[PDB]
Amino acid sequence: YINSENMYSVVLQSSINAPDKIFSIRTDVASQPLATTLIGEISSYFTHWTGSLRFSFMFCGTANTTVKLLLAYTPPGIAEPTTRKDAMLGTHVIWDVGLQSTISMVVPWISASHYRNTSPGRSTSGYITCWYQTRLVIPPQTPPTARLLCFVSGCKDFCLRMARDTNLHLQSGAIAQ
Amino acid sequence: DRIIQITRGDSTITSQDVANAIVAYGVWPHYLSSKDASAIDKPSQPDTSSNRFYTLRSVTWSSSSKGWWWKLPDALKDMGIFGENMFYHYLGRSGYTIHVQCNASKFHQGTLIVALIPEHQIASALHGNVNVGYNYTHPGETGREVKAETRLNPDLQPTEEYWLNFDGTLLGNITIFPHQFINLRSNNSATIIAPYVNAVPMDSMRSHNNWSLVIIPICPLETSSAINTIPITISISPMCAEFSGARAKRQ
Amino acid sequence: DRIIQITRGDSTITSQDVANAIVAYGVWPHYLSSKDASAIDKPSQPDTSSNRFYTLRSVTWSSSSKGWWWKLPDALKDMGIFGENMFYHYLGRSGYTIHVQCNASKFHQGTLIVALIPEHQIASALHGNVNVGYNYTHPGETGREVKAETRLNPDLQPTEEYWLNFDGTLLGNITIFPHQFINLRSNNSATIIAPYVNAVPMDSMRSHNNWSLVIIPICPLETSSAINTIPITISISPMCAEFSGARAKRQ
Amino acid sequence: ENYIDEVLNEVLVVPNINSSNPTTSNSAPALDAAETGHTSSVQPEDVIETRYVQTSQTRDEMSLESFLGRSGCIHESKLEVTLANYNKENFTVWAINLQEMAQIRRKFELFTYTRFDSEITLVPCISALSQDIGHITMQYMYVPPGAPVPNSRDDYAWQSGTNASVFWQHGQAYPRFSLPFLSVASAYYMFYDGYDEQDQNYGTANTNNMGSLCSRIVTEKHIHKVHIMTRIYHKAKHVKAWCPRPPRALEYTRAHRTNFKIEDRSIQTAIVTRPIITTA
Amino acid sequence: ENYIDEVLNEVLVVPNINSSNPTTSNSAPALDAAETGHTSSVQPEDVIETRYVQTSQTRDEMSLESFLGRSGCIHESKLEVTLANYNKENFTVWAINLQEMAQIRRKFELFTYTRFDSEITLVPCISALSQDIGHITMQYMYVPPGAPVPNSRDDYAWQSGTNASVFWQHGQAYPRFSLPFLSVASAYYMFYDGYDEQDQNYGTANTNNMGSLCSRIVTEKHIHKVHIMTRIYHKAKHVKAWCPRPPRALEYTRAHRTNFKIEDRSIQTAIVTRPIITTA
Amino acid sequence: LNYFNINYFKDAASNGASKLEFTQDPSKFTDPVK
Ligand SMILES: CCCCCCCCCCCC(=O)O
Ligand SMILES: CCCCCCCCCCCC(=O)O
């Protein structure tokens, strides 16, 4: 799903009965795959950043379908978790789907200094993962899969400084007049 | 309403259809007063690094299940900072918050009983002069499940009579203990808040179990869908924990 | 007077002949104010369960010794609650209290230099394009002793030039750093109290060493008795420790 | 009180962080509905236990004046002199438009309408192709629409009766001048969905027409061969903007158009693939 | 009252000297114990008979602003132009660091942390390898971390949409500009006892990363062979410092490291030997 | 702390950069509704 709309959603299966992982991304504001969002694009014009981040998820399935999920954030200084037990030992939120179809968690600002480089190089800022909590249950004669969406925006303490030139665009030849 | 939101430490729990909440005996957890204190050393309070939500391993509910039970604080014996503090000290006390989640579709039927029992002393399985071994009352986070196949060391195992509350009292009178129901047509969650109850202000955490959690399916699970096995998940959060008597690690 | 008594947690230290005490830069340790805070989560303060005295392994002082050095907080990486908290979190800060004890008879002579150096960055041993390995700057509680026999991995070891302060500065100018002397004819103890110094309010505890302890015998040990080897013991006590950013254990 | 803050750039303060305590209630601020087209208003002190922190950052560098008030190159003109037919060649004409340099174009195309004053600086360079250069003088004239456009080095249009001109000679500093907001409407157009009166020229090719910029060498016939290259830099002042737009993702191809197709070339963006999504 | 003193540099007065008389008592200020880690507080009027003297010296020149507020060279860049493949070569890139000149490095490494503003001056020089030089123009651009780094003389990165640039031409004075305190933390690191996230690069090689400085020649193709050498000078303003350290005793070998070993070379310091200690 | 600021030309365009004012925090973008 490299050039299509399928790159914005992730599928859930009801044939899985186990505490498995769904996806995991890095929390650096200017790294892939969140470097191309609005906040990521704007941050590429500066060098330092600070503040908290907000993530939102929306469930797109049949109105008779139920599920429970776990969203966790891992502070830096350790490897990426591979089991639910390690993931639980941290900042996490438990989500239950109902009449409301959206949940929102935040990533607190935890760093030694006051600012971070938008291009860190070797350093990291943590990870965020998602795991099955109980199961995905469907009634008879229902599609056996569901989709998910993710959003991102900045909290009230977000800031930028030391403006620079972006690295997400280039000019190879000459623009025709 | 049906909406609830609980935030203990850095973790939050939400649910869109609940049935109120239960405070055991109408008392909220708190710290220890100087009027009742016995030991004289200064206690240690980890605060937010230990009063958070921990989730245990799930279990599978089928049409032939019979029940399960756990024990506290044995279940959280290795959950990070709480377990380390429990194993590094000699005395401790804490409250608890229990959340049970189990969801199904609109074409399922079934009912569960969730109860919290203080000083639940179980009975032995065989006759004669026998007692219960130590390893079988401390199964960790896996808990105990009632089955039928032959187990090892029959002279140390506990009984499997679920209908006798595992100790010789009739099921159905269990409603005096703090409890709640889970009806698949009404709700899918249960919440119980429990303070610290004991005859002494503080006690050893590795030789005494204050509380016990029991889950019993009163009505069998039945559906016509292709999803005939539903998982059940439990989360527990300590409240107002404090420890005393620092020494070397017991392990 | 010559009497001193220090009580940090549940431990007490006494000495009958000391020479005052040193407060590094004339600042007493304290907690972090909201004017300088960067992270927004609530910190955890173990208090008395971690601010206690820990004693390291002893070393032997002979007529041919040359010196030793340690690093902090690497030395206390496995001292109970402090080590567990250090390895379970991501950020932390603390102060320290150092006591060095070494006693002899009235027929011995010798002198030691005890100094505390901030951001002591040591130099490499060989020439060319080389650097210092990770394992050799974190020796634990055993510390590092200057010797002469060939070591493994020569391209990663640090230098042994004790007279150059291990980094290219002449010995004897080390008196600007907080320091004290131990003269066998006058005293047998030294005490230094140090606050938290850094360019950031809080920092990772496993990738940065704030302080360093150096012991150098300036005058050789000499006596006519049958006891020609004297041991040296070091005790350290954290002060006002706090941690933040709870996650899974790094190990 | 006002000099101090702006000298220290301490305007535009940021809210602080308040402490919180464990809660358990019926109201759940974490739950919401995203189908309303609104942004959630959850703050860190609603889902976790926080500490009282006095923030000190100020958001002055993200203002529009700071963001758009930097000089950048917009054009490069090359003029080669010929010693044969001296009075016919040796002049250049360029039509003004801010749509030929990627950086400036992408920076300014983040909005739909803008209104600002301009500032122009010139950097002339002389390349020596002979034993010596001598004395060199250059003239630049601005030709508004409708004014006669010269077509020779000795044309009468260079008298500059009303048109503005500037002169430069070797050994002189860089010329500089200012321009006001010169448009018929109340703002500039970066995107136009419309045509002209003949139903042709779709885009911004019709609304934006600011005139031309001409240059020539004033020195008479000589025996030196040289090349002249001049670079033009632009900076905006007193800026306003409306209706932000998403940033550009691909390379530009033509001016006044949004086409991105390239012959014998696949579509390439800034997104990098991964082997598997369960490993960061 | 305040203009006069500082114009005359009469601030920071020094205490006077008081007269004394012969004494004989039980208290002995000369005796003390040096094991306490303290400095003795004996004054000349305690061990000898003195005269009343009104001192007139002032300690203004030993202040930090005076000590560190002097310009000094920190880098030298050499650029040789080639008439073949003109648009490929003829550019230079340097990474900013104050650790390549002995005098400045040793002067600043007397402390552990510092915080100051900077001031930069450039001194360009042109070497003529042909019959004439002609017209020469140069450009210098500052590239913060993360910004694209040009790799050709005609790269698009030279448009300088947001990056700061400066221009110089023959016959012009020396360029000069100022910089603020640009660091993520609250102070600069001259010594760092730590590693990176991969347990590599011990020292200050990871904390200090301020970007790069690039330069190029803007003049187009010509027929002259020249060499350009530019020197950069730096001076500090509004200085603060913490935690003094002993001065360096040996020669430096590498940047961001404290190694001093040299192949086939004995250790040499500033101490000179004597034949015998009883003869000064 | 303070500084001098005098205009010399008769035109407004001739003057320097505008004085930073506000950010109009109320964002109709976040909540596009009356
Ligand atoms: C040398 C004069 C250059 C002045 C051009 C600045 C004004 C252009 C504004 C709109 C141009 C466009 O959007 O293409
Ligand atoms: C041309 C720009 C030069 C500015 C460098 C001055 C700031 C450097 C401060 C710390 C550098 C270091 O210590 O190596």
C-alpha D59 – ligand 2 centre gap (Å)? 25
Q: Determine D/E contact with 3+ CB pairs under 8 A as the test.
A: yes
Q: Give the nearest partner residue to B6 out of D24, D31, D46, using CB atoms.
A: D24
> For the purposes of burial, counting CB atoms within 10 Å of the CB of E208, is it exposed (0-12), middle (13-18) or buried (19 or more)?
middle
Optimal mutation site among B233, B235, B236, interface A, most CBs of chain A within 10 A:
B233
Contacts of E62 (CB under 8 A, 6+ apart): none
- CATH class, range A1-177: mainly beta
CB C125 within 8 A of CB C161: no
Q: Which technique?
A: cryo-EM
C-alpha E162 – ligand 2 centre gap (Å)? 21
Tokens standing for residue C64: 């041919």
C-alpha E81 – ligand 2 centre gap (Å)? 28
> Which value, in Å, is the radius of gyration of the alpha carbons in chain D?
27
Q: What is the dihedral of CA D267, D271, D275, D279, to 10 degrees?
A: -170
Into how many domains does chain B fold? 1
Which of E 92-151 lie inside 8 A of C, CB atoms?
Answer: 112-113
SS3 D267: coil
E184 CA: distance to closest CA in chain C (Å): 9
SS3 B20: coil
Which residue puts its alpha carbon closest to atom 3 of ligand 1?
Answer: D96
Instruction: Give the number of whichever ligand sits closest to the CA of residue E144.
Output: 2
Domains of chain D plus CATH, in order, are 1-280 (2.60.120.20)
Other beta carbons less than 10 A from residue A14's beta carbon: 18
* D42 → chain A, closest CA residue: A104
C-alpha D8 – ligand 2 centre gap (Å)? 22
D42 has a chain B CB within 8 A of its CB:
no
CB C101 within 8 A of CB C185: no
C-alpha D99 – ligand 1 centre gap (Å)? 9
CB C141 within 8 A of CB C69: no
Which residues in D lie closer than 8 A to residue B12 (C-beta atoms)?
30, 47-48
- Alpha-carbon gap, residue D185 to D207, rounded angstroms: 10
DSSP string, E92-147: EEEE--S-S-HHHHHHHTTSSEEEEEEEEEEEEEEEE-SS-----EEEEEEE-TTS
**Quick one: DSSP state of residue D13?**
B
Strand partners, C68: C145, C215
First to last CA, chain F: 42
SS3 C10: coil
Furthest-apart CA atoms within chain D: distance in Å? 92
Tokens standing for residue B96: 């608890």
Polymer length in residues for chain C = 251
Which residues in B lie closer than 8 A to residue D40 (C-beta atoms)?
none
**Quick one: DSSP state of residue B141?**
T
C-alpha E118 – ligand 2 centre gap (Å)? 8
Helix (H) and strand (E) counts in chain C: 1, 13
- Alpha-carbon gap, residue C168 to E267, rounded angstroms: 10
C-contacting chains (≥3 CB pairs under 8 Å): A, B, D, E
Which residues in D lie closer than 8 A to residue E171 (C-beta atoms)?
171
Contact E161 D132 (CB under 8 A): no
C225 has a chain A CB within 8 A of its CB:
no
- Alpha-carbon gap, residue B194 to B205, rounded angstroms: 17
Tokens standing for residue B29: 């957890």
Q: Give the nearest partner residue to A102 out of D32, D61, D271, using CB atoms.
A: D32
Contact A116 E144 (CB under 8 A): no
Which residues in D lie closer than 8 A to residue B1 (C-beta atoms)?
26
CB E138 within 8 A of CB E256: no
Contact F17 D3 (CB under 8 A): no
Q: Which atom of ligand 2 is nearest to the CA of E190?
A: 13
Which of D195, D190, D161, D164 minimizes the C-alpha distance to D255?
D190
Which of D210, D214, D245, D252 gets mutated to test ligand 1 (max ligand atoms within 8 A of its CB)?
D210
Contacts of B6 (CB under 8 A, 6+ apart): B12, B13, B97, B99, B191, D23, D24
| CATH number where C240 lies | 2.60.120.20
**Quick one: DSSP state of residue A18?**
S
Tokens standing for residue D246: 């998403």
Sheet strands (E) in chain D: 23-25, 31-32, 72-80, 91-95, 113-128, 137-143, 165-169, 176-179, 188-189, 212-217, 226-242
Instruction: Give the number of whichever ligand sits closest to the CA of residue D121.
Output: 1
Contact D104 E159 (CB under 8 A): yes
D62 has a chain B CB within 8 A of its CB:
no
* A106 → chain D, closest CA residue: D44
> For the purposes of burial, counting CB atoms within 10 Å of the CB of F14, is it exposed (0-12), middle (13-18) or buried (19 or more)?
middle
User: In chain E, which residue ranges form alpha helices assigned H by DSSP?
Assistant: 2-7, 64-68, 102-108
Angle (nearest 5°) at CA B223 between B220 and B225:
150
* D31 → chain B, closest CA residue: B14
Which residues in D lie closer than 8 A to residue C39 (C-beta atoms)?
51, 53
* A52 → chain C, closest CA residue: C40
Other beta carbons less than 10 A from residue D263's beta carbon: 4
User: What amino acid is encoded at E201 in this protein?
Assistant: N
Optimal mutation site among F14, F28, F34, interface D, most CBs of chain D within 10 A:
F14
- Alpha-carbon gap, residue C163 to C170, rounded angstroms: 7
Other beta carbons less than 10 A from residue E244's beta carbon: 11
Contact A139 B102 (CB under 8 A): no
C-alpha C238 – ligand 1 centre gap (Å)? 65
Tokens standing for residue A76: 């830096």
Which of A 75-104 lie inside 8 A of D, CB atoms?
Answer: 80, 91, 93, 100-104
First to last CA, chain D: 50
**Quick one: DSSP state of residue E119?**
E
E-contacting chains (≥3 CB pairs under 8 Å): A, C, D
Which residue puts its alpha carbon closest to atom 2 of ligand 1?
Answer: D96
Instruction: Give the number of whichever ligand sits closest to the CA of residue D205.
Output: 1
Which of D 176-195 lie inside 8 A of C, CB atoms?
Answer: none
The residue to which tokens 């809080």 are assigned: C202
> For the purposes of burial, counting CB atoms within 10 Å of the CB of D76, is it exposed (0-12), middle (13-18) or buried (19 or more)?
middle
Q: Give the nearest partner residue to B42 out of C48, C89, C249, using CB atoms.
A: C48
- Alpha-carbon gap, residue B223 to B221, rounded angstroms: 7
Which residues in B lie closer than 8 A to residue C52 (C-beta atoms)?
246
- Alpha-carbon gap, residue E144 to E163, rounded angstroms: 8
**Quick one: DSSP state of residue E131?**
S
A109 CA: distance to closest CA in chain C (Å): 5
A108 has a chain C CB within 8 A of its CB:
yes
> Which value, in Å, is the radius of gyration of the alpha carbons in chain C?
19
Contact E218 D125 (CB under 8 A): yes
C-alpha D178 – ligand 1 centre gap (Å)? 12
First to last CA, chain A: 35
Q: What is the dihedral of CA A78, A79, A85, A90, to 10 degrees?
A: 40
Q: Give the nearest partner residue to E135 out of D101, D125, D231, using CB atoms.
A: D125
DSSP string, C151-172: -S-TTTPBP--GGGTTTT--TT
Residues of the domain holding C79? 2-251
E143 ligand 2 Cβ < 6 A: no
Which residues in E lie closer than 8 A to residue D127 (C-beta atoms)?
134-135, 219-222
Optimal mutation site among D51, D54, D55, interface C, most CBs of chain C within 10 A:
D51
C-alpha D208 – ligand 1 centre gap (Å)? 9
Tokens standing for residue C59: 């070393």
CB D216 within 8 A of CB D139: yes
First to last CA, chain E: 50
F4 has a chain D CB within 8 A of its CB:
no
CB D228 within 8 A of CB D124: yes
